Amino acid sequence: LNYIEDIKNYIPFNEQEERDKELFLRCLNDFHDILTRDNTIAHLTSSAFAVNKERNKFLMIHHNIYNSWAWTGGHSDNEKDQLKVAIKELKEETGVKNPTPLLDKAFALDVLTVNGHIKRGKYVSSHLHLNLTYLIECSEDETLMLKENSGVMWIPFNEISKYCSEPHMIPIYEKLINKLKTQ
Amino acid sequence: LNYIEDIKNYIPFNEQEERDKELFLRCLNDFHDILTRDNTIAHLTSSAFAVNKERNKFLMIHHNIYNSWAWTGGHSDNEKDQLKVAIKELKEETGVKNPTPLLDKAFALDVLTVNGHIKRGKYVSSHLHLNLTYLIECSEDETLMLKEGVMWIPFNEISKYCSEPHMIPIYEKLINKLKT
Ligand SMILES: [Mn+2]
Ligand SMILES: [Mn+2]
Secondary structure, X not given: OOHHHHHHHOOOOOHHHHHHHHHHHHHHHHOOOOOXXXXXXXXEEEEEEEEOOOOOEEEEEEXXXXXXXXXXXXXXXXXXXXXXXXXXXXXXXXXXXXXXXXXXXXXXXXXXXXXXXXXXXXXXXXXXXXXXXXXXXXXXXXXXXXXXXXXXXXXXXXXXXXXXXXXXXXXXXXXXXXXXXXX | OOHHHHHHHOOOOOXXXXXXHHHHHHHHHHOOOOOOOOOOOEEEEEEEEEEOOOOOEEEEEXXXXXXXXXXXXXXXXXXXXXXXXXXXXXXXXXXXOOOEEOOOOOOEEEEEEEOOEEEOOEEEOOEEEEEEEEEEEXXXXXXXXXXOOEEEEEHHHHHHHOOOHHHHHHHHHHHHHHHO
C-alpha cells in the first residue's frame, strides 16, 4: 500500500499514535521528500514486528555495544514500498529466509529520535525517523544468524521488559503486543 | 542578539556545528515558526554553559531521571532574546543571584533530540531542539539550592556525571572552544 495514503488512512491505536500521526502529516505537508536521507530533519523508516505462529514471541536482534535487544528495521532510502523495506531489513539483520507478512498496511506508527553521530567520518545531525511497523510472521524453524548487531533471538512477549533495556522503546513494544492481542 | 541573526551569523566551531547549523537554516526556511512548542517537529531552546571564575568547573543540575547531570536550559517559548531565556533558566534552576554573560551572542549551536513522552496527561511526540548555548560566568560564592540538586562539576569529571552518552561530546566541545 502506497506509503502516503497508507499513512493518511492509518488508524491510531492510542494517544501516542494520534499525536505521532499528526507529526507525520505535518512532515508530508512541509517536505516534498520524506523518503530519503536528503531530508536531514525527518524521513521514513520501516520496522518488523516479527512474530511466531503461536504469537508467543518477538524476533529481535542484540545491538552491538549495548546489552539491549530491539526489533529490526531501516531507512526507506527512496523505496516507496515500506513493507518491502521492513522485510529486507529483517532478513539481513536476523538471517531469516522466508518471512511472511500477515498484513499489507502499517501495523504501527511511531516518530523516533536519532541522536547526531558520525558515520564514515561524516557527522549526521540529530533527526526524526517516521517509522511504520509491519506485522510479519517467521518460522521458529528458521536458522538465526547475526550481522556484524551481536545476536538474534526469539523473545517472549511477557519478558520483553526483561530483555529490552531501552526505556523508551518498551512502551512501543508493549503497544505492538497489546494491539496484536486485540485480534 | 536577535536569534535569527544570531543563528545565520554563528560561526561553526567544528563539523557537528556545521551540519547542525544547516539544519537550523533549513528549519527557518521550511517552518512557519520555531519559537514555540506549536512546532511539534523542531523549536528553539537555549542553554547555559555556566562557568566559574577559574573556568575549571561547569555549574550543572541533577535530573531525578536516570541519575544524570546536565546544563540548565529551557524552551524559548516565544521569547526571542535567547540569552534572556538562558539567564532566566539558570536563575530558576540554580538560584544564582547575579550571573554575568561573557558573550552577547551564541557560544554554541546544537540540534538535540527529545524522546516522545507524557506531559501532564498529553503525549508530546519525539522532536528536535534547536539549541543555542550561552557562556555565562557565575560566582562559586553564590548560595546554590535545587528545585523539586545543584553542583559545580570539574571539567575533567563531567563524563563521570553525565549518563547520556550523546551529551558528552557537547560538553567537551564547549570546554574546548573555551580553551581556545
Ligand atoms: Mn536517519
Ligand atoms: Mn520541546
